């Protein structure tokens, strides 16, 4: 007895086509990009994936922004804790605010 707006849309000749890529394939593409970025750096975006430890990759990023890599290597635990705190804050802000 509860009529739907989608039923009226279909009965009047309006149809919605499904997308070609399902959400599982989009999630697989996202996971592949994340795994490549974590395990290789920017090397997978220019050719084959060259593996590198993540601390040395962060030293590459620090030298890219203009800071000597000994700043990273002598403050590795602090930077890791700050990143984990920021990711947890991203979690809490997505769980709380809906706008």
């Amino acid at each position: 007895a509860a009529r739907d707006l989608i039923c009226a849309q279909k009965f009047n000749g309006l149809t919605v086509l499904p997308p070609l890529l399902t959400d599982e394939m989009i999630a697989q593409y996202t996971s592949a990009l994340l795994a490549g970025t974590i395990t290789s750096g920017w090397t997978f975006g220019a050719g084959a994936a060259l593996q590198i430890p993540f601390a040395m990759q962060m030293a590459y990023r620090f030298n890219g922004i203009g800071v000597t890599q000994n700043v990273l290597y002598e403050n590795q635990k602090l930077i890791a804790n700050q990143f984990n705190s920021a990711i947890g804050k991203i979690q809490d802000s997505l769980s709380s605010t809906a706008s």
Binding site: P19, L20, L21, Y29, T30, S31, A32, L33, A35, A49
Partner: peptide
């Protein structure tokens, strides 16, 4: 629309996975 989604997300040639 499918062209937009393909050109945004399908930028990697191989499906990498984490150890």
């Amino acid at each position: 629309q499918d062209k937009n989604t393909q050109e945004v997300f399908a930028q990697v040639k191989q499906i990498y996975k984490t150890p």
